[PDB]
Design a protein around this ligand. Structure first.
Ligand SMILES: *[C@@H]1O[C@H](CO)[C@@H](O)[C@H](O)[C@H]1NC(C)=O
Ligand SMILES: *[C@@H]1O[C@H](CO)[C@@H](O)[C@H](O)[C@H]1NC(C)=O
Ligand SMILES: [Cl-]
Lengths: 201, 232
């Protein structure tokens, strides 16, 4: 009826805590989730690594990203790894997450801050040259601005992480979309969203 | 497809504008100026010589720029004209780019993120857009334990300094904590001093200590743990 089954839980993926609980200490961008996290300190740290061991997926493939752009991606990782408010979007493929609605501001700022940075592909979900252990751009793939390969914010949100996220037309504080980062001072705006979606309505 | 990082130096771009407006009139047929410059601008807008990350430190950039400027001035001071001038100039740009590639490859292998543990913030310049911003070099969460034995009644010095600290940006204070067996801590000093001195030590000063070098950011730049033995 209200999906409490689906509230305050962690997905069964390889890095996740089996159940959420508070953390004394999380690294940088993952701190907003301290209160109650699906990530350990180690996980939160690993989210900030160049070629983070979590996915062995390189952000530098077209060269080092502008720091502003790197920040967005890392936050996305913290969110996926640490959020306890994802139940409604969990699916088995041992579980993943599908079409989590990221508020338009989240996708817009991300897109905006990565405009100057460079990539070679528009579907990062596959088709890379994988020979070094880490992905590199395949034969003939040109490095160009993000705004070329992801013409809209929506493209960026949805395609980088294989439809884990959905770019919502809904804006923030609507009750109906999640933030991939939030200021810890202001308290977690995703809890109510989670509750809403767990419900029949 | 990337610019030659050297145009991120204003003196370089101004030197090239001066070449166009001041040098070409007296040294090359007027009917060639336009095309010559288009060709130079293209030389600088693409740098094919280079696993290149597209970044450079101010030092490397400067070295490159100084070098290019020395050679360019060599040519303009020689007062050379016409086909000769054209050939020398483009040879020189070419040579310079190759030289610079060397400087970059060295920088990547020696000066980029030289920290071996912890987190160093270092300013870099992004070649594609000349934008100068600070990059976080993340090596390890830790910097690892120090085992330290101090003769009773000599002074205990705990050194938190690493080589790279002085060069890193966005660092704040060295914090030293005692780590008690009951899982609590006490902050014993917090300051710009990289070492902790505790004089004329007794058995009561043995045990665990931790250094945190603080960051303008949310997390510390260096964590070092010390285990102190007092030798009677
Ligand atoms: C990342 O690389 C390591 C080391 O080569 C490999 O063993 C591991 O399976 C990779 N991690 C993931 C999560 O795929
Ligand atoms: C923990 O142990 C230390 C050292 O024995 C003692 O001074 C301190 O009062 C203890 N702290 C607490 C909170 O019990
Ligand atoms: Cl959340």
């Amino acid at each position: 009826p209200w999906g409490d089954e689906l509230l305050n839980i962690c997905m069964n993926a390889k890095h996740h805590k089996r159940v959420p609980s508070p953390e004394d200490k999380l690294y940088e961008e993952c701190i907003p989730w301290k209160d109650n996290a699906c990530c350990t300190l180690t996980t939160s740290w690993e989210a900030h690594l160049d070629v983070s061991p979590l996915y062995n997926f390189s952000l530098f493939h077209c060269g080092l990203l502008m720091p502003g752009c790197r920040k967005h991606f890392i936050q996305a990782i913290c969110f996926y790894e640490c959020s306890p408010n994802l139940g409604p979007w969990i699916q088995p493929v041992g579980e993943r997450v599908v079409n989590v609605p990221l508020c338009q501001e989240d996708c817009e700022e991300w897109w905006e801050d990565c405009r100057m940075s460079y990539t070679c592909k528009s579907n990062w979900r596959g088709g890379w040259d994988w020979s070094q252990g880490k992905n590199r751009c395949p034969k003939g793939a040109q490095c160009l601005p993000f705004s070329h390969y992801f013409p809209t914010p929506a493209d960026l949100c949805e395609k980088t992480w294989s439809n884990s996220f959905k770019a919502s037309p809904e804006r923030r504080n609507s009750g109906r979309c999640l933030q991939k980062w939030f200021e810890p001072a202001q308290g977690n705006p995703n809890v109510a969203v989670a509750r809403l979606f767990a419900s029949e309505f | 497809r990337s610019p030659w990082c050297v145009i991120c130096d204003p003196s370089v771009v101004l030197a090239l504008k001066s070449l166009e407006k001041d040098y070409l009139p007296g040294h090359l047929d007027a009917k060639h100026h336009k095309a010559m410059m288009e060709r130079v601008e293209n030389a600088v807008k693409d740098f094919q010589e280079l696993a290149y990350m597209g970044v450079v430190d101010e030092a490397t950039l400067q070295k490159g720029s100084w070098s290019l400027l020395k050679d360019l001035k060599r040519i303009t001071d020689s007062d050379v004209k016409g086909d000769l001038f054209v050939k020398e100039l483009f040879w020189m740009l070419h040579l310079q780019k190759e030289t610079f590639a060397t400087y970059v490859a060295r920088f990547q292998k020696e000066a980029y993120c030289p920290n071996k543990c912890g987190v160093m913030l270092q300013t870099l310049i992004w070649c594609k857009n000349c934008k100068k911003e600070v990059h976080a070099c993340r090596k390890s969460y830790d910097c690892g334990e120090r085992n330290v034995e101090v003769p009773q009644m000599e002074d205990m010095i705990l050194d938190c300094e690493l080589n790279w600290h002085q060069a890193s940006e966005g660092l704040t204070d060295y914090s030293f904590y005692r780590v008690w067996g009951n899982n609590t801590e006490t902050l014993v000093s917090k300051g710009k001093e990289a070492t902790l001195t505790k004089p004329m030590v007794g058995p009561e000063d043995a045990g665990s200590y931790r250094c945190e070098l603080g960051s303008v950011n949310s997390s510390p730049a260096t964590i070092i743990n010390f285990h102190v033995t007092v030798l009677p």
